[PDB]
Every structure is written in C-alpha cells, then in structure tokens.
Amino acid sequence: HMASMKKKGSVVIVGRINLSGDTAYAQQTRGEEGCQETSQTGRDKNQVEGEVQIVSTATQTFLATSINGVLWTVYHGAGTRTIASPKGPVTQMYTNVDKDLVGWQAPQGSRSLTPCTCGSSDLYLVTRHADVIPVRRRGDSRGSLLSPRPISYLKGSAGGPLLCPAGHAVGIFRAAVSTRGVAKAVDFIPVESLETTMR
C-alpha cells in the first residue's frame, strides 16, 4: 500500500479578478493541463498580479484574497494543501478549520488589501465571475444580498473579498445562505478574525 500512496496536489493560481481599473473582470492565466501539471510539481513560475486570485485544486475552483501580506482562502476548498510557487510548494502559514480559514505568505507580485477600520455596514462582494454585488452587513459574519441570486451564481466564490466603499477588506466570503436554491444572504469571515489570527 505504502509504495503507491498518492499525495494531494498543491493549490494552483489559475487566474485573477482584475479590480485595477474601471471594470471588474476575470482573467485566466493557466488552462487545465498546466494547472494539473503545476498542482503535481508545486512549481508555478507565472507572474502573480492583483489582490484576488482564482485558485484550483483537482476538484474545485474558488478564490483567494491577499490581505496584509497573506493570501487567504477557505479551509473547505484548500484543506491543508500547499500552494504552488516559483520556488516549489509553499506550506500554509495559517490553518484554522474552526474559522474555515487558511493562509499562505502572499505571492511576490500580488497586492494586498488593507483591513477596514471604517466600522461601516455598506459592503460589496466580488464573485469568481467578477460581479461586484452590494451586500448590507447584518452582523459580524453575515450580510444580506440587496438582490437575491440562485446559489449557482455564488458557487466558487468562497475565498473572495467583501469590501467597504473605500475598498478596504471587510471579510472573506465563506458560504451562501440559501432557501430553495436562492441566496439572500452570505456568511463571511470578518477581517478582524484574520487580524487576530495574524497577531
């Protein structure tokens, strides 16, 4: 049994959500074959740019967001996996199954969002398809969608950011709250929880 035991691959950056300009849009930087190879080696020589990465395992594609020099995502997507990097696989710097949170050192080339200090409740969720959806904050870890969507619309957005009007990071999207397939609210990991994890 031992000789044939497999290893899980690395998480692989396969694109980004470009927020650098007037228009939000998803860009793909690696196709499926390159992703599969890179997951195996853990060696990714692609140049990273931006705050929000699109990331993949063998089974899921989701998001990861840089805040304070850490690339954050959800445990339910990444598990305990390494992330591929120019120098080989990079081990998680944070792992917290209870928070549904993991982090790696932010890749060179990435830009980080700053944690929000505004203490305000009018937010914006960035999805894996680069939609920017208004969300009213309803508690420390929940927000309501101003316009409800089918859950399919949010699938694969876990790990992406909720932002304040000034563009600071307020949280990391975790899960939709749904009834009969329709999302009217979102659960997120508040940035203060990340800040506690960091300090």
Binding site: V74, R174, A176, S178
Partner: peptide, 6 residues
C-alpha cells in the same frame, strides 16, 4: 434553513 459552503 439553510447554508452551503461556496
């Protein structure tokens, strides 16, 4: 209900 990890 309910909830669904995304």
């Amino acid at each position: 209900p309910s909830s669904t990890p995304c």
